[PDB]
Amino acid sequence: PLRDLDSEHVSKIVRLSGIIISTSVLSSRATYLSIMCRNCRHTTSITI
């Protein structure tokens, strides 16, 4: 149950039941980034 959560269960897998009351709007997060340096013009990439 939701009230039976303690310090033991931290970085561990739990199974929970309940009711949903909120759902926010979808946000954008990056997965692949391409960048450039504003002074010398060096280019590289990033993967998340």
């Binding site: 391409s34 002074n39 010398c40 013009r41 060096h42 280019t43 990439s45």
Partner: protein, 195 residues
């Protein structure tokens, strides 16, 4: 080189003296071209420095491209790039105009492209160009860096020197030279006029 002072900076001047040393002519890279085998496309870039425009610009320090906008590796095409030549020379006051028993004064001249191999060490020369102050004289942290950006370089001839003397011949001059020949005492007239 002795009477050239800090009140003549940023003006066009004529300087007399003797060439004392010349450097090696080196290439300078302006535009570099590349190839990408994964897209079959060629890319280029431009480079510049402070000794090519008479007015001050905001620096652009671009970098040498090895990589494409996606990550493809580029081959460098040495035959398709453009290179322009460079040389530096030093000038000093002539020994027969300088004060005796006194150390001499010298000035640096920068030459590029076509004016790059016009003289040799030990020559009488006249140079015209802009007397430029460069960089920052330690105010970011002796004084300013001064040199002449050459535009004109004239060789001059003097007694007991390695530069020859030649004159331009007018057609009128040629006519007298050729007229004198027919008279059959050319040798005597030319011989008696020798000192």
């Amino acid at each position: 080189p002795r009477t050239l002072t800090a009140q003549h900076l940023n003006k066009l001047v004529s300087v007399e003296g003797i060439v004392t040393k010349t450097s090696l002519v080196r290439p300078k890279l302006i535009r570099s071209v590349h190839y990408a085998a994964k897209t079959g496309r060629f890319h280029y870039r431009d480079y510049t420095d402070a000794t090519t425009t008479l007015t001050t610009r905001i620096p652009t320090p671009a970098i040498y491209p090895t990589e494409d906008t996606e990550g493809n590796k580029l081959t460098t095409e040495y035959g398709y790039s453009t290179f322009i030549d460079h040389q530096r020379i030093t000038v000093q006051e002539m020994p027969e105009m300088a004060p005796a028993g006194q150390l001499p004064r010298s000035i640096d001249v920068i030459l590029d492209d076509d004016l790059v191999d016009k003289t040799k060490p030990g020559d009488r020369v006249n140079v015209v160009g802009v007397f430029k102050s460069l960089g920052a004289g330690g105010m970011n942290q002796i004084g300013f860096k001064t040199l002449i950006l050459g535009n004109t370089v004239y060789p001059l001839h003097a007694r007991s020197t390695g530069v020859a003397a030649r004159q331009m011949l007018t057609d009128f001059d040629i006519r007298n030279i050729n007229k004198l020949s027919k008279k059959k005492d050319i040798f005597d007239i030319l011989s008696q006029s020798l000192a």
